Ligand binder design. Structure first.
Ligand SMILES: *[C@@H]1O[C@H](CO)[C@@H](O)[C@H](O)[C@H]1NC(C)=O
Ligand SMILES: *[C@@H]1O[C@H](CO)[C@@H](O)[C@H](O)[C@H]1NC(C)=O
Ligand SMILES: [Ca+2]
Length: 463
């Protein structure tokens, strides 16, 4: 049962490869033109196509850089490795796919650049504002000897950095970092405050680490008094904590959703009192650095990925690019499939697959294997195609303007292949009255200076 490679009526080696990854092509030259050309390599070999003429590329995945994951008890010896492998060379056929895998293992503490964006509006009692200050001092005192880095920004009507990352690293003293804070006692411009942090606090000159996890703890006691968008803070993991009587109604709590990351059930936290601020972050802190999540950069438009995750105790979750509830030294893995659509023009592209908050990454160098190697001697104007009327690449003719056929001979389109038996009017007769040649199931009459020959079967001579 002639399958996809044979059926599609292909006219060259390139679109034969473009039919399907399983298709191979024969370029024998010496072969009855109406023989099969695009088929599986086994079927091509089953007929007597010259075995060395067969073109059958195969997609492949080759590991280039495969530093092993670092173990627990790791000194910075050529730095630590948390993603393996780190570079892979992918070669893909037209519309083909190829799987690969990566192990991820959090070897190090986990670098987090955390910003406190705390409400300083007029609604806060002097004690409540102090509870917020002591909350931040508590968090920083509890995390002094970790890879956490802290910045704090008070916002009301205005936005003010009380200290940034370079200030925290330099002093490491929560009391001294916050001693100058004066309660603003004004409005609640949450939109502009989040934009301020995203562009004016998360900056490398001010101590921010470019590969660290960006976290935003927003503490507020009322709805925002400004408006706009926070597109500039899309790359920051944003928690928001609404505290007090102004978030009693579920309506008021829902206004906070657009400020926090998704889903709101994870990143929006509602409290009735400021006393519960100590215990609340204690639980938040457990989900900040306990999750590996794959992040795809520079993925070409013609490429699509699918992920199957093995997330501790061999729970094989199809669809997931993340695993949560991880500890130091745990190892997870992801099976990744990359399918291309057709064949892009730029034949070499790269992209990155990286865990959020990691410097380690997997770079995937892609090359698309679409052309046939028999473009070597493609013989334009070949004597196999009516002398000039066709280019002879890969053992067949690619017909120039006008002409058609196996050899570029049939000129005016026969269209419907039908049969050569439509060249003689009845079963046993010779074709074209013996005054012409059957070309693509249609008679083409012998030319003579003695007179024209016409008719469907070249029966009429005009002397
Ligand atoms: C800070 O914590 C790390 C974590 O083990 C420890 O190795 C280091 O000695 C601590 N520093 C001080 C000054 O205690
Ligand atoms: C994910 O698992 C499904 C079912 O086992 C399989 O069909 C698919 O190829 C897998 N994908 C990858 C990228 O391994
Ligand atoms: Ca308020």
């Amino acid at each position: 049962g002639p399958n996809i490679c044979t059926t599609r009526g292909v006219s060259s080696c390139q679109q034969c490869l473009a039919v399907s990854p399983m298709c191979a092509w024969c370029s024998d030259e010496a072969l009855p033109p109406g023989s099969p050309r695009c088929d599986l390599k086994e079927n091509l070999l089953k007929d007597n196509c010259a075995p060395e003429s067969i073109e059958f590329p195969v997609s492949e995945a080759r590991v280039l850089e495969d530093r092993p994951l670092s173990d627990k008890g790791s000194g910075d010896s050529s730095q630590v490795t948390q993603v393996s492998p780190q570079r892979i060379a992918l070669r893909l056929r037209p519309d083909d796919s190829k799987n690969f895998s990566i192990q991820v293992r959090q070897v190090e503490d986990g670098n987090v650049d955390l910003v406190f964006l705390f409400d300083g509006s007029m609604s806060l009692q002097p004690d409540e504002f102090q509870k917020i200050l002591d909350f931040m001092k508590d968090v920083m005192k509890k995390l002094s000897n970790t890879s956490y880095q802290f910045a704090a920004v008070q916002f009301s009507t205005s936005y003010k950095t009380e200290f940034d990352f370079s200030d925290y690293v330099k002093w490491k003293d929560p009391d001294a970092l916050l001693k100058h804070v004066k309660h603003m006692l004004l409005l609640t411009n949450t939109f502009g405050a989040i934009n301020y942090v995203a562009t004016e606090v998360f900056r490398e000159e001010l101590g921010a680490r470019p590969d660290a996890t960006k976290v935003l703890i927003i503490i507020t006691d009322g709805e925002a008094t400004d408006s706009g968008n926070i597109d500039a803070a899309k790359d920051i993991i944003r928690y928001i904590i609404g505290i007090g009587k102004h978030f009693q109604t579920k309506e008021s709590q829902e206004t906070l959703h657009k400020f926090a990351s998704k889903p709101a059930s994870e990143f929006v936290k509602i409290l009735d009192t400021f006393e519960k601020l100590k215990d609340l972050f204690t639980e938040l802190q457990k989900k900040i650095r306990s999750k590996v999540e794959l992040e795809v950069r520079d993925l070409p438009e013609e490429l699509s990925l699918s992920f199957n995750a093995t997330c501790l105790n061999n729970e094989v979750i199809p669809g997931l690019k993340s695993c949560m509830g991880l500890k130091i030294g745990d190892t997870v893995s992801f099976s990744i499939e990359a399918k291309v659509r057709g064949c892009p023009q730029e034949k070499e592209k790269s992209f990155t697959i990286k865990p959020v908050g990691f410097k380690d990454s997997l770079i995937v160098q892609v090359t698309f294997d679409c052309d046939c190697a028999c473009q070597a001697q493609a013989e334009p104007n070949s004597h196999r195609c009516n002398n000039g009327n066709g280019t002879f690449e890969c053992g067949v003719c690619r017909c120039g303007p006008g002409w058609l056929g196996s050899q570029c001979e049939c000129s005016e389109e026969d269209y419907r292949p039908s049969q050569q038996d439509e060249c003689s009017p009845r079963e046993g007769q010779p074709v074209c009255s013996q005054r012409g040649e059957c070309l693509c199931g249609q008679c083409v009459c012998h030319s003579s200076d003695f007179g024209k020959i016409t008719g469907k079967y070249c029966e009429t001579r005009e002397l």
